Design a protein around this ligand. Structure first.
Ligand SMILES: [Zn+2]
Ligand SMILES: [Zn+2]
Lengths: 138, 114, 40, 187, 134, 97, 138
């Protein structure tokens, strides 16, 4: 059929200057991310430092859902360049040069051990028994 | 024989038994995610260290121009006459000085012993 | 007598033992950690 | 001594020594050897030995799946898993990054007054003294993680008996300071 | 509807995009073109059991680039955007990864040497003074 | 005297007394490498099919070959033999390396 | 064609005769001092941070290209003359060369009067020259 010998041509173009910036962010392979549950999302600059030279904080569905922290890719774009090819009704591919690359790691929401009581916990360096009796007190 | 990761926070899964239904189940440190059977082996350990050394041998050892080459023993898989033989000589001691033959033909990383 | 064992006849290849724990210490050290500690 | 295997990676740039290492089997029973041989790291300007898993959590990797990926590349072989799990068993006190940085900073010779000083000090010593060749700029963090993972992978490979123990007297592992680099250091 | 919300319509459409690595001279030529409208033609040909991807440079831009596909399933890659009006959006998900290589085999190193001469320009070395300073 | 001192250092040259084996001097054919910036080799490898260590997928660095430049891990490569042939060829031509 | 086994005992010795005629017996010393003077010294100077001042006006000193001259001797009257190595041995002198740096001094007076002075080659010290290197009189 036609799909066996499909020969089609696509026009490519790169804009010089544009209003919106373009970036790349990636999840882990085994993170098991699902975008259908992302009814509400937030992405805001973290207040732990206290702006552009700071990590990001991402939150899904408020406090109910999972939340991530975003860091910049370490590789400078001196000899590297990445473009994004998007489908359009006109058909001419519009190459978007990258501004920055980001990376996000999952962070669970639960009762988290604090350092002040970890100072008391550290007396059980190797004497600790029944490891799941620690979070029951917490 | 091996350990697995939970799909909620990606941490360890130690095995235990519950007080209600009498079956082995894995658990994480902060999860309600309990796993199931078919991995009823916890601490397998070969004390005799009779493990097969024909697994950690890389197929690329053919392309090392220092190891001896023989032609008396042909390849069992692809039938190539020439082959590369060497000894294990790992950090282990009291080891048998056998020759782990590796076929030298490209696209055939067959290894064997005699 | 807290480590009873079931020995096997020498005809078989395995020659294995079957150490368990009984009501003598069952009727803070947990299970599967005490057994690995006595294995060590 | 008590330190069975050592993973020295004395590092510099165009020096700081890291002494990641591994305890021996000196103890027995449930009191010390209840889990196995732990793996621990010495760090250059702190004065005590923090476990390597706590360092990796201080790098910014909460998930232990990513940690054992950095340590162990092929998940098919369980030997490295069952050798590396005791230091995970010594790592349930700390779960998130800031507690790890607070513990590492408090473990130094001169700990800070509070979190604003200890976190910053631990971040600084982890930033531009941890392995200076792989990264010194602020956005160099997962290259450090991959290099330390390769380091612990080398340590485990020599522990279970694949990599041969390196020797100092091998001149492949030895460099010669001539008049050039010596006068460069003085200048 | 909020400032921090990211538009997720691109993910719901299951839009598949391609991420490709190119060498620096192609990027320099595309920058020199300054978006005239066309920089080259992308060619694809599928056989009975194999595929072939290439890119042909524009003749005006010059005055063959075969593509090599690679494994993608080791990671999940998606692309988002940030606007000047602070309206975040998601473009889509990367479904295929390729890399661009030059067809020049021996002469290309010469250009590499020239780029070395372009890269050894700012590095600076000490000089010898015949006369001591006055 | 170690096995690796073959043509590196003289096997006969050694002072007597408390410094036997600690002081030694070069053989006739031994040029000590004086140093070079690893930037041309790094950008050269970036031109070829090196996946960057930060860009690469996690579960893809087990079947490949790790590349070490000046002791710093820089990435992996799936075809090491062709890389070695190209590197050795350019080293013999002494034009880039 | 090929080197016969008869001619090898001359061929290899012509090869290493050419080696010892080109390189010499002391080449690691000379090349190390060459790659210490030609590079590293200015790399060390440029890699050093530019020193910063405060009082308010702000003064910033930035270091630049490193000049080195031939070894000179200054007698009682202050006459600079080229100094022989034998002159250095007989008079118990120190064979050394004076080192020069260009320094840019940028001024700030909080009124947008950034008018830096390109302070030219200034004398900062002397490096002892290793004999028969390229930056030597011999
Ligand atoms: Zn979990
Ligand atoms: Zn074969």
């Amino acid at each position: 059929g036609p799909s066996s010998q499909n020969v089609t041509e696509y026009v490519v173009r790169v804009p010089k200057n544009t209003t919106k910036k373009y970036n790349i962010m990636a999840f882990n392979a085994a993170d098991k991310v699902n975008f259908a549950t992302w009814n509400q999302a937030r992405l805001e600059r973290d207040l732990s430092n206290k702006p552009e030279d700071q990590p990001w904080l991402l939150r899904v569905n408020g406090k109910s859902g999972r939340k991530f922290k975003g860091i910049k890719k370490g590789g400078v774009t001196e000899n590297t360049s990445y473009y994004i090819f998007t489908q359009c009704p006109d058909g001419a591919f519009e190459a978007f040069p990258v501004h920055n690359w980001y990376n996000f790691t999952p962070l669970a929401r639960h009762r988290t051990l604090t350092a002040e009581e970890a100072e008391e916990e550290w007396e059980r360096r190797n004497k600790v028994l029944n490891h799941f009796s620690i979070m029951q007190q917490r | 024989v091996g350990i697995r990761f939970c799909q909620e926070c990606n941490n360890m899964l130690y095995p235990k038994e519950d007080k209600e239904n009498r079956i082995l189940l894995y658990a994480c440190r902060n999860c309600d995610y309990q796993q199931e059977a078919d991995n009823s082996c916890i601490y397998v350990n070969k004390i005799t260290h009779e493990v097969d050394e024909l697994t950690q041998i890389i197929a690329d050892v053919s392309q090392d121009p220092t190891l001896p080459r023989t032609e008396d023993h042909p390849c069992q898989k692809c039938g190539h006459k020439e082959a590369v033989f060497f000894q294990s000589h790992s950090a282990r001691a009291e080891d048998a000085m056998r020759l782990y033959y590796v076929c030298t033909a490209p696209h055939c990383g067959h290894r064997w012993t005699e | 007598d807290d480590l009873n064992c079931i020995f096997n006849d020498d005809n078989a290849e395995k020659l294995v033992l079957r150490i368990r724990i009984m009501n003598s210490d069952e009727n803070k050290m947990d299970d599967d950690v005490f057994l690995r500690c006595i294995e060590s | 001594s008590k330190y069975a295997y050592t993973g020295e990676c004395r590092s510099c740039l165009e020096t700081s020594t890291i002494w990641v290492s591994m305890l021996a089997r000196g103890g027995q029973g449930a009191k010390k050897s209840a889990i196995g041989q732990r793996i621990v790291a010495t760090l250059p300007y702190i004065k005590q030995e923090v476990p390597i898993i706590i360092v990796f959590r201080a790098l910014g990797f909460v998930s232990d799946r990513d940690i054992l990926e950095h340590i162990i590349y092929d998940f098919e072989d369980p030997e490295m898993m069952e050798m590396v799990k005791p230091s995970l068993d010594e790592a349930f006190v700390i779960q998130e990054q800031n507690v790890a940085l607070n513990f590492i900073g408090s473990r130094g010779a001169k700990p800070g007054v509070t979190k604003e000083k200890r976190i910053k000090y631990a971040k600084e010593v982890l930033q531009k003294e941890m392995l200076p060749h792989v990264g010194v700029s602020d956005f160099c963090e997962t290259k450090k993680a991959y290099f330390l993972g390769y380091m612990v992978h080398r340590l485990l490979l020599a522990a279970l008996g694949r990599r041969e123990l390196d020797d100092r007297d091998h001149y492949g592992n030895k460099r010669l300071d001539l008049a050039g680099p010596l006068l460069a250091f003085l200048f | 509807a909020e400032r921090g919300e990211l538009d997720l319509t691109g993910a719901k459409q299951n839009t598949g995009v391609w991420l490709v690595k190119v060498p620096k001279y192609l990027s320099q030529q595309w920058a020199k073109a300054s978006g005239r409208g066309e920089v080259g033609k992308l060619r694809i040909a599928k056989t009975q059991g194999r595929t072939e991807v290439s890119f042909t440079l524009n003749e005006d831009l010059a005055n063959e680039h075969p593509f090599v596909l690679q494994s993608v399933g080791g990671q999940t890659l998606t692309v988002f955007t940030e606007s000047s009006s602070d309206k975040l959006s998601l473009e889509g998900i990367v479904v295929q990864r390729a890399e661009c290589r030059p067809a020049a085999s021996e002469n290309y190193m010469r250009l590499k040497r020239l780029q070395i001469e372009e890269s050894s320009k700012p590095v600076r070395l000490s000089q010898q003074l015949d006369k001591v300073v006055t | 005297l170690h096995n690796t001192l073959w043509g590196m250092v003289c096997p006969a040259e050694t002072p007597e007394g408390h410094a036997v084996g600690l002081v030694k001097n070069l053989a006739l054919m031994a040029y000590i490498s004086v140093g070079s910036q690893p930037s041309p080799i790094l950008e050269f490898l970036e031109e070829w099919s090196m996946e960057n260590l930060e860009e690469i997928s996690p579960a893809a660095i087990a079947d490949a070959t790790k590349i070490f430049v000046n002791g710093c891990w820089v990435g992996i490569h799936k075809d090491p033999e062709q890389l070695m042939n190209t590197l050795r060829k350019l080293r013999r031509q002494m034009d880039i390396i | 064609d090929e080197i016969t086994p008869d001619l090898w005992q001359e061929a290899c010795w012509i090869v290493i005769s050419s080696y010892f005629d080109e390189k010499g017996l002391v080449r690691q010393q000379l090349d190390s001092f060459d790659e210490f003077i030609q590079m590293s010294v200015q790399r060390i100077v440029e890699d050093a941070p530019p020193i910063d001042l405060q009082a308010p006006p702000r003064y910033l000193l930035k270091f630049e290209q490193i000049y080195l001259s031939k070894p000179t001797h200054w007698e009682r009257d202050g006459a600079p003359s080229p100094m022989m190595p034998n002159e250095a041995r007989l008079r118990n002198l120190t064979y050394s060369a004076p080192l020069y740096v260009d320094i840019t001094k940028t001024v700030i007076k909080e009124g947008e009067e950034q008018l830096q002075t390109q302070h030219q080659k200034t004398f900062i010290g002397k490096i002892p020259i290793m004999l028969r290197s390229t930056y030597c009189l011999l």
